[PDB]
Amino acid sequence: AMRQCAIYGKGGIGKSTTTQNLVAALAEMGKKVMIVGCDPKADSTRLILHSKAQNTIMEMAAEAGTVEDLELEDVLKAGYGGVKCVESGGPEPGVGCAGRGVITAINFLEEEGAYEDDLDFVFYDVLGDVVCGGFAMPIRENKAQEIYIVCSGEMMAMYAANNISKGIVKYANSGSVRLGGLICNSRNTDREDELIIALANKLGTQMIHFVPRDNVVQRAEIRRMTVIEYDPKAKQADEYRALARKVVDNKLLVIPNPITMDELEELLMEFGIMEVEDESIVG
Amino acid sequence: AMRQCAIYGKGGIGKSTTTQNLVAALAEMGKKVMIVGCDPKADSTRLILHSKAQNTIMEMAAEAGTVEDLELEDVLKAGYGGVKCVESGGPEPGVGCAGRGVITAINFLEEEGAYEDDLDFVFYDVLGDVVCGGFAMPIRENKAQEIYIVCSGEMMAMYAANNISKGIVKYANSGSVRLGGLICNSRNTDREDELIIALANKLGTQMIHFVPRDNVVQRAEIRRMTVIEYDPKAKQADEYRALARKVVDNKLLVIPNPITMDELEELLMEFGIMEVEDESIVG
Ligand SMILES: Nc1ncnc2c1ncn2[C@@H]1O[C@H](COP(=O)(O)OP(=O)(O)O)[C@@H](O)[C@H]1O
Ligand SMILES: Nc1ncnc2c1ncn2[C@@H]1O[C@H](COP(=O)(O)OP(=O)(O)O)[C@@H](O)[C@H]1O
Ligand SMILES: [Mg+2]
Ligand SMILES: [Mg+2]
């Protein structure tokens, strides 16, 4: 058995930091994991590979001739803890469809035997600002059974969580794609944990973890590492281990109940997210 | 003559707040303006209309039968300062292409005579996390000659600015689409103004204005108003008037020079954006 998981969320919310650190914690436990980058930014594997980024399937297929000229052992690279890494890539801005590379990448990995019996987890790191084309494919074509949405007390982050949830509902007649949880990636905003717990309850899921805002992330990433590798004794390393334990143990996988913009606005007004005038901890 | 402008930028960066306040300032001067919402969130006109939002062309076409059953006087509503407002809308998450509504909306407005001789400005408020489908259309089909990109010292915001700039370059053989400027929507981060000035210089443009982070925006928006209407004597009202004056007077419209991710990373490292540990003004 393997668990196919996808990390969705708006741009800049912390999908790649969260996914690579969660996966580093799973590898540290002895789990075998593959990360599939499904974001055109294509830096979803750099902290596992100690790299600038990784050459994408779209880029390499173009150099080799066709995608059928590529070998698995060429798009798939191992880094920290033997975690296997691949990047979809996508077309340059203003050309075709930004998500087209995800379709090509996932089909290539399936055909070429990437999904080896002894993988415990696969994580897709997926752009979530639009739910269409290749970005919808993991949900529409039943590739990721467990969706975890990284969000914050930001209206845009919660709107994106609600939109991804609407996509999961749309495809619930087919396949087994479910919402597994919200991950609150802290803005250092007051009552933000309570806000995302409230949003998770309205959607019918849970807040699986509150990830603190910790500068050790910046210090680790300047050195192209996860916090797990950079400073395994950091408080933030234990935060990612807590997230990893709760993902491993999670059994709540639901068809979510998307909410209205009225409900989103009421949540923000309720937890005083818009009336606050400073961070919880200053500094 | 009329100036067709588009406001691009990543999700949550401040496109709709900035556009509606800039446009309110233009109306306050005596300019005739239309806002065209090109973001599926479809709340790009609510502060002009004193409204929850506005019913979208996609929604109304479906109720009327075809888009040819709609009349202009039905998708186009006037609010503060006689500013005319329309929302494209888009398909629900997981259905078709998130940008399809923008194509339908702009073609409808052109056919039905929305672009009246005495308009001074049109502003398209465009989702910028992906540069494809309807979101690329204002650039690909030469609808918005002046692109202004709202950004911040956030890597994701600067990456999005660079991607939009790559889209403008791609279509420079045709039409007259140009980069007009960066608008820095402040995160209250130290040396952020210097960072976006540096990015603008690398791209060959300018930072047309630094918009401060001011809670008066939240107080105005809870009352469904621009700061211009809510408190015309606010410091932030004068900030939007300054932006509006510089847009009116702007003559620098360039084919930008997109930069490498190495250059983006070097900018952030140079201005100490990643090593900072608190906001410029605490509180
Ligand atoms: N918990 C955190 N603490 C500190 N910085 C964080 C945290 N999570 C993410 N970041 C930073 O936020 C930025 C965006 O995160 P990233 O994972 O790249 O977002 P996404 O992949 O969703 O676009 C990066 O600079 C990253 O280091
Ligand atoms: N300069 C600012 N000062 C304070 N709050 C701001 C400012 N600019 C934007 N905001 C707030 O940030 C949020 C996102 O802005 P918005 O314009 O809706 O983003 P976008 O349209 O790019 O998704 C809103 O709550 C808005 O009030
Ligand atoms: Mg990422
Ligand atoms: Mg908006």
Distance B10 CA to ligand 4 centre (A): 9
Comparing CA positions, the residue from A134, A136, A70 lying closest to residue A98 is: A134
Q: Where are the domains of chain A?
A: 1-283
Residue A129: its chain B contacts at CB < 8 A? 10-11, 127, 129-130
Burial class of residue B157 in the structure, from the number of CB atoms within 10 Å of its CB (0-12 exposed, 13-18 middle, 19+ buried): buried
End-to-end CA distance of chain A: 45
| Joined tokens for residue A90 | 């996508």
Residues with CB under 6 A from ligand 1: A 9, 11-17, 185, 211, 213-214, 217-218, 221; B 155-156
Give the Cβ contact number of residue A188 at 10 Å: 16
3-class secondary-structure state, position B190: coil
Q: How many degrees, rounded to 5, is the angle at CA B3 between CA B1 and CA B6? A: 160
For residue A211, the cross-strand partners are A185
A to B CB pairs, distance under 8 Å: 122
Q: DSSP letters of A162-193?
A: HHHHHHHHHTTTSS--EEEEEEEE--S-TTHH
Helix-, strand-, coil-residue percentages of chain A, each rounded to 5: 45, 15, 40
Reported structure resolution in angstroms? 1.6
Question: Does domain A1-283 sit in CATH 3.40.50.300?
Answer: yes
- How many whole angstroms separate alpha carbon A22 and alpha carbon A181? 14
For residue A125, the cross-strand partners are A7, A37
Comparing CA positions, the residue from A27, A21, A73, A74 lying closest to residue A45 is: A21
Q: DSSP letters of B87-112?
A: E---PPTTSS-TTHHHHHHHHHHHHT
User: Helix B133-140 and helix B100-111: axis angle, to 10°?
Assistant: 40
- How many whole angstroms separate alpha carbon A198 and alpha carbon A270? 10
Element (H, E) at B182: strand B178-185
Q: DSSP letters of B150-164?
A: EE-SSHHHHHHHHHH
Residue A187 φ then ψ, to 5°: -90, 10
Distance B140 CA to ligand 1 centre (A): 32
Question: With contact defined as beta carbons under 8 Å apart, do A103 and A137 qualify?
Answer: yes
Cβ neighbours for B190, distance < 8 A, ≥ 6 positions apart = B272, B273, B276, B279, B280
Question: With contact defined as beta carbons under 8 Å apart, do A37 and A88 qualify?
Answer: yes
| Joined tokens for residue B53 | 């939002």
Question: With contact defined as beta carbons under 8 Å apart, do A165 and A157 qualify?
Answer: no
For residue B281, the cross-strand partners are none
Q: Would you tell me which residues 113-132 of chain A have a C-beta closer than 8 angstroms to some C-beta of chain B? A: 127, 129-132
- How many whole angstroms separate alpha carbon B98 and alpha carbon B132? 10
Is A280 in CB contact (< 8 Å) with chain B?
A: no
User: Method of determination?
Assistant: X-ray
Question: Counting every residue, how long is chain A?
Answer: 283
3-class secondary-structure state, position B189: coil
Q: Does the annotation flag A82 for ligand binding?
A: no
The owner of tokens 């709760």 is A246
Residue A87 φ then ψ, to 5°: -120, 130
Question: With contact defined as beta carbons under 8 Å apart, do A147 and A180 qualify?
Answer: yes
For residue A209, the cross-strand partners are A183
Report the gap between the CA of A118 and the closest CA in chain B (Å): 31
Task: For residue A142, give the DSSP letter.
Answer: T
Cβ neighbours for A149, distance < 8 A, ≥ 6 positions apart = A7, A8, A9, A128, A160, A161, A164, A165, A179, A181, A182, A183
Active site residue A10: yes
Cβ neighbours for A186, distance < 8 A, ≥ 6 positions apart = A152, A192, A193, A210, A211, A212, A213
Question: With contact defined as beta carbons under 8 Å apart, do B207 and B179 qualify?
Answer: no
Question: With contact defined as beta carbons under 8 Å apart, do B161 and B182 qualify?
Answer: yes
3-class secondary-structure state, position A206: coil
| Joined tokens for residue A127 | 């752009």
- How many whole angstroms separate alpha carbon A171 and alpha carbon A178? 10
**SS3 readout for B8-35:** ECCCCCCHHHHHHHHHHHHHHHCCCEEE
Is A53 in CB contact (< 8 Å) with chain B?
A: yes
Q: How many degrees, rounded to 5, is the angle at CA B225 between CA B280 and CA B103? A: 95
Residue A170: its chain B contacts at CB < 8 A? 92-95
3-class secondary-structure state, position A79: coil
Task: For residue A105, give the DSSP letter.
Answer: H
Element (H, E) at B208: strand B207-211
Cβ neighbours for B249, distance < 8 A, ≥ 6 positions apart = none
Q: How many degrees, rounded to 5, is the angle at CA A167 between CA A123 and CA A55? A: 35
Question: With contact defined as beta carbons under 8 Å apart, do B62 and B89 qualify?
Answer: no
Q: Does the annotation flag A16 for ligand binding?
A: yes
Comparing CA positions, the residue from B70, B130, B142 lying closest to residue B99 is: B130
Element (H, E) at A102: helix A100-111
CA separation (Å) from A95 to A87, A186, A203, A245, B205? 19, 35, 36, 41, 23
For residue B254, the cross-strand partners are B179
For residue B211, the cross-strand partners are B185
Q: Whose CA is nearest to atom 1 of ligand 1?
A: A213
Question: With contact defined as beta carbons under 8 Å apart, do B14 and B188 qualify?
Answer: no
Residue A96: its chain B contacts at CB < 8 A? 132
CA separation (Å) from B175 to A125, B113, B138, B171? 36, 21, 11, 7
For residue A227, the cross-strand partners are none
Beta strands in chain A (DSSP E): 3-8, 33-38, 77-78, 84-87, 121-126, 146-151, 178-185, 207-211
Burial class of residue A42 in the structure, from the number of CB atoms within 10 Å of its CB (0-12 exposed, 13-18 middle, 19+ buried): buried
Active site residue A202: no
- How many whole angstroms separate alpha carbon A107 and alpha carbon A126? 16
Question: With contact defined as beta carbons under 8 Å apart, do A166 and B92 qualify?
Answer: yes
